[PDB]
Amino acid sequence: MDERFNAALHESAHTVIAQVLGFNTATPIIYENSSTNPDEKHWLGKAFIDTTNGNVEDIALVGLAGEAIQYYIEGVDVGDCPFIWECNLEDISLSDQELVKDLYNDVELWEKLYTLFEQHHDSILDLANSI
Ligand SMILES: O=C([O-])C(O)C(=O)[O-]
Ligand SMILES: [Cl-]
Ligand SMILES: [Cl-]
């Protein structure tokens, strides 16, 4: 459940940031991985977010949000998030990388994301507690 709640926070951060930026969403889901491969996560998640229309930087904020909520909770400095993201790329999903591309280097987006977390972490927790 310790790892399950982190899978929950991840999808909830994606979802709430998307909502704050005006993107349509449906409630995300959390489910157990049946794989016996030690290199895979045991708890998986899926988000349902319309990123078809949106601007590149807003989509990147949604893409960053999943891993970012942990950086925020753990106290990583905004200016250090680009390095931290790059170091963890092998463990960041390809779909998040597709939404972000190289905008993880943008310290102003990280500053913005942290500000949104500051203002909406309660909504993030409420959603995570419900999935
Ligand atoms: O692949 C993912 O990161 C996730 O399942 C999603 O696309 O919502
Ligand atoms: Cl909202
Ligand atoms: Cl919505």
Contact 93 CB / ligand 1 (< 6 Å): yes
Contact 101, 60 (CB under 8 A): yes
* Structural domains counted in the chain: 1
Name the resolution in angstroms.
Answer: 1.9
Q: What value does the CA radius of gyration of the chain take, rounded to a whole number of Å?
A: 14
Separation of alpha carbons 131 and 129, rounded Å: 6
Separation of alpha carbons 84 and 104, rounded Å: 10
Q: Ligand 3 centre and the CA of 120: distance in Å?
A: 15
3-state DSSP helix/strand/coil percent for the chain, to nearest 5? Answer: 65, 10, 25
124 Cβ contact list (under 8 Å, min separation 6):
9, 12, 13, 16, 69, 117
- Helix residue ranges, H only, 47-106: 56-74, 81-87, 94-100
Separation of alpha carbons 77 and 111, rounded Å: 9
Query: Which residues form the domain of 62?
Result: 1-131
Contact 47 CB / ligand 1 (< 6 Å): yes
Cα maximum dimension of the chain: 40
- CB-proximal residues (5 Å) to ion ligand 2: 19
Which uninterrupted H or E stretch holds 39?
A: none
Residue where the block lists tokens 């905004």: 78
Token output for 5: 């709640």
- Long-range own/partner contacts, residues 73-78 (CB < 8 A, 24 or more apart): 73/9, 78/107, 78/110, 78/111, 78/114
